[PDB]
């Protein structure tokens, strides 16, 4: 059962873009199909989405530009481990 996480430092959050992390052994083909499934389920509900990147090689999953309203839908997708809202990093 998948969980959601966002930056506790509220000025550092970047809402509207989410990293969907799939379970460790998920294959690239499964990541892409999950991403397209999200987009189709979203479109059915009247929501625009953009898949910005599909990850494989370290962590399986994808980066999606979408409204936060779709988060409970996305957490119910096959293979989902967790979802993290994007946030800022800074030169030290």
Q: Which residues bind Hg ion (CB under 5 A)?
A: 7, 87
The smaller minimum CB distance to Hg ion, of residues 20 and 42, is found at 20
Position of minimal CB gap to Hg ion? 7
CB of 38 to Hg ion, least distance (A): 21
* C-alpha dist (Å) from residue 67 to 11, 22, 85: 19, 19, 11
Rounded to the nearest 10 degrees, how much is the dihedral formed by the CA atoms of 13, 72, 64, 87? 10
CB of 33 to Hg ion, least distance (A): 27
CB of 16 to Hg ion, least distance (A): 14
Give the pair of three-digit tokens for residue 43. Answer: 């479109």
The smaller minimum CB distance to Hg ion, of residues 67 and 87, is found at 87
The smaller minimum CB distance to Hg ion, of residues 47 and 82, is found at 82
Instruction: State how far Cα 26 lies from the chain centre.
Output: 14
CA quadruple 83, 87, 91, 92: dihedral sign = negative
The smaller minimum CB distance to Hg ion, of residues 17 and 41, is found at 17
């Amino acid at each position: 059962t998948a969980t959601f996480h966002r930056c506790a430092k509220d000025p550092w959050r970047l809402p509207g873009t989410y990293v969907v992390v799939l379970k460790e052994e998920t294959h690239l083909s499964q990541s892409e199909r999950t991403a397209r499934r999200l987009q189709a389920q979203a479109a059915r509900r009247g929501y625009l989405t953009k898949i910005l990147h599909v990850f494989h090689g370290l962590l399986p999953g994808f980066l999606v530009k979408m409204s936060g309203d779709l988060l409970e839908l996305a957490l119910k997708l096959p293979h989902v481990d967790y979802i993290e809202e994007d946030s800022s990093v800074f030169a030290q």
